[PDB]
Design a protein around this ligand. Sequence first.
Ligand SMILES: CN(C)Cc1ccc([C@H]2C[C@@H]2C(=O)Nc2nc3ccc(-c4cccnc4)cc3s2)cc1
Ligand SMILES: CN(C)Cc1ccc([C@H]2C[C@@H]2C(=O)Nc2nc3ccc(-c4cccnc4)cc3s2)cc1
Lengths: 237, 240
Amino acid sequence: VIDPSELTFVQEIGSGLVHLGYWLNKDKVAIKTIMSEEDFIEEAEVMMKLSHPKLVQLYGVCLEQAPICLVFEFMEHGCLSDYLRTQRGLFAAETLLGMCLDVCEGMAYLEEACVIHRDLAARNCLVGENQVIKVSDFPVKWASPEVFSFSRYSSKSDVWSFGVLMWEVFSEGKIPYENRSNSEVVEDISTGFRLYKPRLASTHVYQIMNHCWKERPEDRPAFSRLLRQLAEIAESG
Amino acid sequence: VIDPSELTFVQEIGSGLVHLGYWLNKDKVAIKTIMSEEDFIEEAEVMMKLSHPKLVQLYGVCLEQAPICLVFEFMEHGCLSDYLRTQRGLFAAETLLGMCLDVCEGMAYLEEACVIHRDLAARNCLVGENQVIKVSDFGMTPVKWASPEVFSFSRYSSKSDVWSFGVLMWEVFSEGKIPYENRSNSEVVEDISTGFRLYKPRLASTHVYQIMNHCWKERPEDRPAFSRLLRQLAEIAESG
Ligand SMILES: CN(C)Cc1ccc([C@H]2C[C@@H]2C(=O)Nc2nc3ccc(-c4cccnc4)cc3s2)cc1
Ligand SMILES: CN(C)Cc1ccc([C@H]2C[C@@H]2C(=O)Nc2nc3ccc(-c4cccnc4)cc3s2)cc1
């Protein structure tokens, strides 16, 4: 890759001849437009510290009035939900398990950092360079019994949502509980109904989804446990 | 952090709403100034393919004539050699081992990439963000870092780079002291051929000195590979 002259020389540093300079380059970013000015600088700085290759990075904020904004890393292929739907019938099960592995890697970091996503779904996940999936944006169809009944959020409630996300991936973006009302989803899950097994998902994969969908959160596997299991299936293939 | 208006809006992508935009940020770079144009566009692309957190990245090249130049990632604390000397008596053994580990990661990647540095030394390594060490000046195209097959037959391999690494370790652990300080090239060649090795630095442990000696085995086939050295150096770091 070649540079024209967006290079600014400053001073010598080396002794061949080296220089300290600036490289003012146009980087593609995603800008989200939007009380408590001081708190939002801290809130962004806290989110900025949550760095991981499988999480969409927030570069900064703009507070110089007018429509105020958040600066994020640009994901070249948009959201996972749309990426799956527009490519339906062209996926290999390997690609789909890879997508789930990326999400789990990011989630295993969030679990370790003690951060509850609260709303993990394919619409909240984005597709980047060479189909890499990154987690972003931190709803009853992705809710666990403790969450839709009591709003009892934890990493284990994010584990349930990941079970739903996995199904969304292996079903190539199908709508979970397609024609079901908020009350009907609650009734169905309570009565013991679980999402069907997609053809692209193996018996071991569907077993993992069902483990994420266990009634009591303490019966569900943590993301660190899920990461090691999915990493093994990925490499053994 | 805060951004003012170094933001350029382009198009709507979201529906809160999201926009595709460009961000013009002032990135600190190191510019090295200088065989047809075509060949050096390819060589710059090949060197750009060699990406690792422990190697100084080449961002690109400038070919719009006048003095032609190469643009690298800037390293805020300069070269290792000078950083060791200017901070002597202020290093913990853990920091020095941490420095050797950094070089080892970068070198193990170059080893696997089938790339031979040919001139590994503290003078070529650079210090960055929170004392991180990164290898530099490998594909840019002395007896003290040279292995016996290199000073005898010029047999350069990843194994000869391991010898340079053992000497680099000595430079690190001796806080930038000159190896074979008052020894002529003829003196160095002779001494190493008889079996004499660099003495153990004060801050280097017994286990660390064994590592350094394995890097200094007469035969390259007896020296440990960077992959083996990494696992061993990482193990020492995680425990003690
Ligand atoms: C030339 N090329 C730039 C044209 C082009 C235009 C539009 C798109 C669309 C598909 C891509 C897209 O939607 N990218 C996005 N990236 C991000 C990153 C972060 C956030 C984000 C994160 C957190 C909160 N809110 C938004 C949203 C998006 S949409 C691709 C290429
Ligand atoms: C903010 N600023 C005003 C303070 C400041 C400026 C300069 C330095 C000097 C010490 C640092 C330095 O020497 N950095 C270097 N970085 C590189 C990166 C690549 C190469 C390089 C690599 C391969 C081939 N040629 C050159 C040389 C250097 S020197 C420290 C603080």
